[PDB]
Amino acid sequence: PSMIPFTIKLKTCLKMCIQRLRYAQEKQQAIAKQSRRQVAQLLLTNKEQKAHYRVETLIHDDIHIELLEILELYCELLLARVQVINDISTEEQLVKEHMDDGINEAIRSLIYAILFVDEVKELSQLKDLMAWKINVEFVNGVIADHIDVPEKIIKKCSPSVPKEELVDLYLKEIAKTYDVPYSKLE
Amino acid sequence: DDEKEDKLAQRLRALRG
DSSP, X not given: OOSOOHHHHHHHXXXXXXXXXXXXXXXXXXXXXXXXXXXXXXXXXXXXXXXXXXXHHHHHHHHXXXXXXXXXXXXXXXXXXXXXXXXXXXXXXXXXXXXXXXXXXXXXXXXXHHHHOOSOTTHHXXXXXXXXXXXXXXXXXXXXXXXXXXXXXXXXHSOOOXXXXXXXXXXXXXXXXXXXSOOOOO | OOTHHHHHHHXXXXXXX
């Protein structure tokens, strides 16, 4: 395992993140759905306050999920374009040449997400496999100055406090699905 | 019921878009 084909190490590495990224999805989706259930439970107990703040969490967890489906995709995208990834060695290349196919918008973000998503430890492997293809400077140029990192990404990683409106709107919806009678403060 | 919470979730997300 010394002089083995890049194209291979990368294909297996990505394939991994996918497998785990989806696992996190299935698990957190089911987990979040059971939280919704409990949210309704708190309504049927006049615990208005404890049902409010609780939902705020429901949002951040739901937003996290989104960030996963998005990272999933970004990988799959790269996995296919593996052949095209092997023909790169400088930043200039990826930057102003593979921006239409989304190769850049995908790899750059994934590396950023490393710190923020710890349920897919294997992601870090990609950062390392970048110096293997480019350098150790590229990675630091992302984790630090998120150069060309999608807006929706950086934002779903550290989601801003939930808007009062969205919360109330959420509660009202959880009620129209489980029961409850009075959703006050709307 | 059972399949009612499924759509609920489906509608939730879009509701934040």
